[model samples]
Target: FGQNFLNDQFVIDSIVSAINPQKGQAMVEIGPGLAALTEPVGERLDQLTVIELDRDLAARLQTHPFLGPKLTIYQQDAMTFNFGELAEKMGQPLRVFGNPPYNISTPLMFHLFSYTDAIADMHFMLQKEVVNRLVAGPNSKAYGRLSVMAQYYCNVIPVLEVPPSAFTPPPKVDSAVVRLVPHATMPHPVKDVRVLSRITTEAFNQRRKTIRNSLGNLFSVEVLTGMGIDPAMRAENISVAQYCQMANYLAEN
Candidate 1:
């Protein structure tokens, strides 16, 4: 697959400890490369489902002596997998764990959010920069679309950082393990996620420009002023709730 795999036993143990899979709980592992974390997790849980894209890896995993009927392997693209359906089969919400591919982390996360209603939590090894964005605060350099949207759905927590040497191929960039627990309800509710996504996208697309200038086409200065938002502020200065408010206002008008 030409991708770096997390092969460090210490790191693998730490990741499994953080997940803490319990009996009768629904657990899904994505990209279980080399079974480093999988073997331990599967040992504890009565059942563990894994989604692997690599055919060879999937076939090899099926042959692991420890993997018996407890391990369910699905050879499919995780980004499009029907997580909701899987949860229904398991009779409970899923606790998703994975070392997601660096190439598709962004889209993969967005895809996972669709199953928020049926997800207990998610633990992932993501690019260090992305972990920063997930936990980034307003006014920070890393704060952008990813920060705003991810925060809207989950409470992102940066747990630990991993060096390049921890992986088999040694990726050039460092990686970090982050925990994302979806909120029972959004911190701030928006009438439309799509519209809110658009507002955040456009605002950050021209992040250097003031809100008034960047959003001039979508909203009027008076409208923003009435909402108590300063036109002079940059995109990073606004909160996720503020973005929701603006998006709601935009859609209503």
Candidate 2:
């Protein structure tokens, strides 16, 4: 677990208040390192679930008197954890929060996306660069496969910024909190979400290449042009919804 444990009380208060956990809302926290954010959030809920990969921290959490009976600890990696089963047990969509290890942020988010049906929303502390990509729009330098894919599943919003000084062992980069609210109704629904993923992956793999050249293996220039997309445009030049349309076309034919 490569994490800069959060230490600023002000930042912790801001994050917990932003989450605004209701009394009966089903919520889970990931990597509750040192239980800084955990204790406050746990106090706001009747029951709380936390996933901590560190054995020592999990054991420490078990002994907390305030969390007794109100807390359930899972000593498991958040990336490989089965969120759907937990959601099923809770019998409701879960509000998820965490200050996860920065290195696994990308793949971990994609894993979470696969369990969107069970997730109500997510609030997480992430590297600022990652947050920029999550909420970036077309034509921006930050826009890429992550921007397109994340937008396809949720409404990504930058909630607040936390400086590097906020952590005990401060990271080299800035940190921020982002909210991911799963779409109640998908804005750009595709026949197969995996098709959308594949298309975006190809398009951004060679982002410098024209859309037609980047996606040539999967979609022809003529097909793209016929769909009203300029084949000469680069991947960052294309909008997320437009990419979804391309994916839908591929899925259909």
Candidate 3:
């Protein structure tokens, strides 16, 4: 109920422009509060599906003049929803967008990652600092688990910034839009993605420790050195490609 409804038309227009909704594309929006972004995006698309958890909003969408036949409303949780099924039904990878609740944004993004094969791209309004970490490079303080995993899956692009005043109830933190396009083919293919996830979790969880100490149980320093990774380096200094290499190695031996 403590949601920030986007009120500034200028910012809305900017976000819609970035999305550039096409008439026949399979488009779905998460948490379309007050139909702010929904209306603009739906106007351009032949059909749009929205996952709105709030019954009030879902009820509103059910009868909205612009949404009659062209709209599909799912009164369900975005994080738990099976997006792959939806994409399969559409017979194409979906283009998804939303200004999701910041409280669950991190986990929500991770949840969406599970359906990357079914998703063409995603545009989201998230906390600005989260956006920074999502698109950060190695050696940066913002670079960590999120950076590595996100980049491994998609090309993270910074879209634009939106001031707090744009929302009905201004949030304390600045917000930014990000575009994520899944790699058609993995740049650094790994034997197991779960291994990469595990390695990253271990590495970043002990960021202050050297990579050798963090990953010593799963990998030896000698093997890590052979992979062209400096075992002496901290997790923040390791590239996503390097992580994929480690994961592949772990998967094989």
Candidate 4:
């Protein structure tokens, strides 16, 4: 489903500032609905590609006076889009931005993270709850698989909070802009992303369960103790590095 487009000029300017698009840089926008942030970023970049799922908006954007050869519009679902292939043609990592659809924000973020090697940086407007998950600290109620996984690959910075009133048909809840810059090297390397993801997913599936109970079969209590982690600790209490270490340790044995 399409989200409310942020049409406020000041909000649009702030989002563009957070992206800080340069003239020679390669940039890809996920959903350029009504060209709110796209217009300013396009003005500065030589080439700015946008992946829009909405047909009506895509057609309208194609005919806009400001849109020319420099703006490439791809009518496609952003989640399934081949960011790696696009990055290859540009011959450089990409700076991506968008106010993503709230329904698919988490999966879309994970989808983009798959192309971490090709992404220079990403600025996204996401549900306030999701942003909290991205930057949540260990032991925080908001911490979960998304928290560990996102923070594992990128440094998430919350830029600005947008009130519900900021949108055209305002959402029930507030939203926030976040920047995700992938690390050249993972802060903590896990041999198997799937294994780590699985571990995290299962742990959080029953948030009340302790590590010893949730992961009892996959890993022993002693192993957790050896890592200086309490066997009774829940998923949120574990740090990103600790999650990687747990996954790597499980993978080896």
Candidate 5:
């Protein structure tokens, strides 16, 4: 087993149980290293697609006696995969899962967001802190761009927590499982995602500084005050909806 390979069968069973992949749902697994959960998920579905960056593992999967016919493996980075194309080809939305490396967890989540419309749901095993951030709300230290953007598109749910002992080599920290299901429509859709991104980035760039100073270049104190947002508040204090409102104002003006 490699450094990151999961070795705990109980943890393995827990992940698949939480995902509960049903028939008719297009399922894609990320980094199915050693098929810890793949074999089970594959048994449940008629066919399965897995994205693996490991060339050796991909080749092994292609020839694996049990997975060969029913599992199609992609030898590429999940960060750049066109999951939406997969959904279009399959004729149904896809459900994505993985026990992702914590190093790419944040960016991976963002990459998956690109195909929200084509996705039915996503479940991942991420660092516990990342999970906390995904489900974090306004006014918390964990609340930031991830929280805002994740909540903007999906309803994130914390499923279960896993200890470091679950992995083969055992990670230094704990891991947690989380699920994300995209909203049928935006809770508060802004006209310009760019402006909202800019706003949040600027606001959180200097979390310790007040918005009057951090976002001063984007919007003057008077403009922010006029919008009814307290310019004296810190970035962590602003809700996702309030940020969208601020961004919308910036776009409209």
Candidate 6:
């Protein structure tokens, strides 16, 4: 799919501002379409790495006069790229940012989560609705699995609103920029991340149902009451810590 490129200089400037690249820190930009944000961003960092799935774009990046050794282009799918390795080799937690392909943004975000230990911060342009879920709080319509999991590991900051007109060929949906700073220490570390993930998916999969019903096989009404959680409540009504508490307990047994 041909993703729309960022064309508004104002939005580009703000994206770079949110990136806030330092003198020697490593930063990776995903899908740096046409180098619109890359040029100014590269000017701020000692070096920049870009993950571009497009071979032609990667080749073009290699020959940019001003970028020279300052740029490292990885012509690869970001879904399985070695971001952590790149950061480890650089000897610093990378500051990562990008305007990812809209079609691939969700799974791309999940992949980025795997490298939080090696990442200092992340800024991305994504669907505005996705941004809402990233930063949504408990009891809100937007809060769910993505909200719980993201907030558990990072501080989600919605930084800017980008209009469809900002892209060369506008997308139908609204867009926004989000800044994610992975916690230096996870706030609510679950015993098993998989358990937490599984429980959350189950709890939210049938969000309209009572949590006990939603979690039919995982936990029962008696178990919920014993844990001080109301089985009658809905998924969005449960706080992140509460979900983690349930998941941690589930892992223990």
Judged by TM-score, which candidate is best?
2
lDDT of 3 by residue, 129-188 (tens): 999999999999899999988998898999999999999889999999999999898898
Each prediction's total of clashing residue pairs, residues at least 3 apart in sequence or on different chains, is 0, 0, 0, 0, 0, 0
Q: All candidates: CA RMSD in angstroms?
A: 1.3, 1.0, 1.2, 1.1, 1.6, 1.3
* Candidate 6 segments exceeding 4 Å error: none
Query: After aligning candidate 5 to the native by TM-score, how far in Å is the CA of 192 from where it should be?
Result: 1.4
Among residues 3 or more apart in sequence or in different chains, the pairs in candidate 4 whose N, CA or C atoms overlap within 3 Å are: none
In terms of lDDT, model 6 sits at 0.87
**TM-score of each model, paired residue for residue:** 0.96, 0.98, 0.97, 0.96, 0.95, 0.95
- lDDT, candidate 4, equals 0.87
Candidate 6 backbone collisions, by pair: none
Model 2 residue 232 distance off true place after TM-score fit, in angstroms = 0.7
Where does candidate 5 clash, by residue pair? none
| lDDT digits (tens) for residues 1-253 of candidate 1 | 4568878889888888888888889889999978888899989977789999899888988999887567899988898799989888888899998888777889988888878888889999898999999999899999999998999889999988999999988987889999999998777877788998888988999999999999898889999999999999999999888898998897788
Candidate 5 per-residue lDDT over residues 62-170, each given as its tens digit: 8888888998889988888898899999999999998765667789888888687888999988888888898998889899888988888789999988888888778
- What candidate 2 gets wrong by more than 4 Å, as runs, is none
lDDT of 6 by residue, 82-107 (tens): 77888889898888888888778888
Against the unseen true structure, what C-alpha lDDT does each candidate score? 0.88, 0.90, 0.90, 0.87, 0.86, 0.87
Cα deviation of 230 in candidate 2 (Å)? Answer: 0.8
Worst lDDT 10-window in candidate 5: 1-10
As for candidate 3, its clashing pairs are none
The TM-score, computed over Cα atoms with residue i paired to residue i, of candidate 6 is 0.95
Candidate 2 per-residue C-alpha lDDT over 19-92 given as tens digits, one digit per residue, 9 for 90 to 100: 99998788999889898899889888789999998899999999998986788999988988889998999999
